[PDB]
Design an enzyme around this catalytic site. Structure first.
Site, PDB file in Angstrom:
ATOM      1  CG  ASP A  33      -2.079   1.113   0.972  1.00 25.20           C
ATOM      2  OD1 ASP A  33      -2.257   1.593  -0.179  1.00 25.20           O
ATOM      3  OD2 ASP A  33      -2.750   1.460   1.919  1.00 25.20           O
ATOM      4  CG  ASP A  67      -2.361   1.863   6.767  1.00 27.32           C
ATOM      5  OD1 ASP A  67      -2.631   1.628   5.578  1.00 27.32           O
ATOM      6  OD2 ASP A  67      -2.414   3.030   7.219  1.00 27.32           O
TER       7      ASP A  67
HETATM    8 CL    CL Z   1      -2.934   4.247  -0.603  1.00 25.54          CL
HETATM    9 NA    NA Z   2      -3.095   2.671   3.676  1.00 29.13          NA
END
Ligand code: CL
Ligand code: NA
Ligand code: NA
Length: 203
Positions: free
Chosen positions: A9, A173
């Site tokens: 990410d 996350d």
């Molecule tokens: Cl992102």
């Molecule tokens: Na993120």
């Protein structure tokens, strides 16, 4: 069984974010009731659409001006919006470069054109490297017209890249993004805010 591919990410995991700074910067250019609009949810629509590439950057800015009732410039809007983005610490860029020795590294990000332009210009360039050097391919919500945690985005990545989910490790996350990926057979790790997750790769 063994991991061949990483899906990383952008927000939080690589680039540090500051929602407060962004909100305040919007208030400073005149979006007085932006927190009030957030509750209204008039906002969430325009942000969700941008994130899936369903409106253009021109539409996004016009949409912001319309909600502000003020004729602020594109430069102003972009500056306030891009202020959500802080920095990719260079040790994370070193790590991405190193990981390429062992893994095919991909980015999978919910993001938008304005932010992406910003990170490609201001965060990824490092030493003699640019964004193309860190990743085999970058999978971006706004280009794909899908967003995590929709199952279809993960299946689209694995199909396009021609990879086995079971040989794939995803770092994000967001707990729900990871739980959906897990259902597809992808292994995951969910770092905390500001976490240096290089410990995952210690020999
Ligand atoms: Cl992102
Ligand atoms: Na993120
Ligand atoms: Na590349």
């Amino acid at each position: 069984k063994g991991i061949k591919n990483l899906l990383i990410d952008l927000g939080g995991v690589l680039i540090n974010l500051d929602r407060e700074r962004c909100i305040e910067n919007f208030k400073k250019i005149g979006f007085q009731n932006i927190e009030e609009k957030f509750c209204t949810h008039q906002l969430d629509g325009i942000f969700l659409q941008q994130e899936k590439g369903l409106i253009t950057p021109a539409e996004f800015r016009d949409g912001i001006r319309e909600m502000m009732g003020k004729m602020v410039s594109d430069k102003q809007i972009d500056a306030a919006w891009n202020s959500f983005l802080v920095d990719i610490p260079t040790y994370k860029l070193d790590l991405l470069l190193k990981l390429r020795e062992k893994y095919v590294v991909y980015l999978l990000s919910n993001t938008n054109d304005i932010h992406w332009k910003w990170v490609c210009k201001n965060a990824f360039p490092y030493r003699t490297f640019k964004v193309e050097d860190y990743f085999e391919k970058t999978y971006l919500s706004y280009e794909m017209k899908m967003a995590k945690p929709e199952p279809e985005i993960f299946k689209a990545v694995t199909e396009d890249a021609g990879i086995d989910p079971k040989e794939t490790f995803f770092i994000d996350d967001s707990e729900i993004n990871c739980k959906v990926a897990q259902e597809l057979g992808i292994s995951t790790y969910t770092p905390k805010a500001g976490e240096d997750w290089s410990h995952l790769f210690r020999k």
